[PDB]
């Protein structure tokens, strides 16, 4: 099906009572308003928004009686940087926008990519990091 | 005079007892180790440093019986980008790090020099700042 216009927004997936069919894709795919791929359980999506609006993970893209097909990003390695003060962040932030590394910064957590030659930026700045696995849940501005 | 060596370092400067001959320079200048100025008080001041050894805002130049001649930053217009959490310092010094510009991130506050073009990105982001003048007290790394 073909994909025009976003009909709803999942606002709590754990009280969500319909069940959810998702489309994961790219954290890159978010900033996108074309794109073509299967969801979970097998259903063909073409979205091919008619509008500017950006892609928001939770996105509903069809409803029916019982299932919502909404888009979601995979989930992937990332690095959850944990500065433990406004001048860690700071310093930590100002780095990684001047190698011009596609982030999240949430709360008191900075969102990275797992990147290998980051870490000796990481430590260099002294700020404290751990590898886990997330879905970027943001769609990168710029 | 021709300074090769740093011969001191001014703690604060309400408690010294000295009088201070500063020679003021430009905030790109702490990370040089060779120029030359006249200080305040007309002492010719090559600074010709024979180690790696960066600058630092108040360090002693040369020592005399009364006298201290020292190096600090000059006055000059800047934004002092006051960040209300550690989400709006991380992205805010994001943006800043990623157009590449000049700046200081002490304790809560970042610190960039004057720019108008400049104004749209900290509203844009959202930022509390304000307009001042300052003197910068920390060579930038890079
Ligand atoms: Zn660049």
Chains 1, 2 share one sequence.
Not at 21 to 28: A, F, K, R, T
Not at 32 to 58: F, H, P, Q
Not at 67 to 90: C, D, F, H, N, S
Request: proline fraction near 1%.
């Amino acid at each position: 099906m073909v994909i025009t216009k976003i009909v709803g927004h999942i606002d709590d997936l754990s009280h969500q009572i319909k069940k959810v069919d998702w489309l994961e894709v790219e954290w890159e795919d978010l900033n996108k308003r074309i794109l073509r791929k299967e969801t979970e359980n097998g259903t063909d999506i073409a979205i091919k928004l008619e509008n500017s609006g950006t892609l928001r993970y939770g996105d509903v893209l069809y409803e029916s009686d019982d299932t919502l097909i909404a888009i979601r990003t995979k989930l992937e390695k990332v690095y959850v940087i944990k500065p433990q003060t406004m001048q860690e962040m700071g310093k930590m932030a100002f780095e990684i926008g001047n190698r011009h590394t596609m982030c999240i910064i949430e709360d008191d957590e900075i969102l990275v990519r797992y990147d290998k030659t980051l870490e000796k930026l990481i430590d260099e700045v002294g700020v404290s990091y751990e590898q886990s696995e997330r879905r970027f849940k943001e769609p990168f501005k710029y």
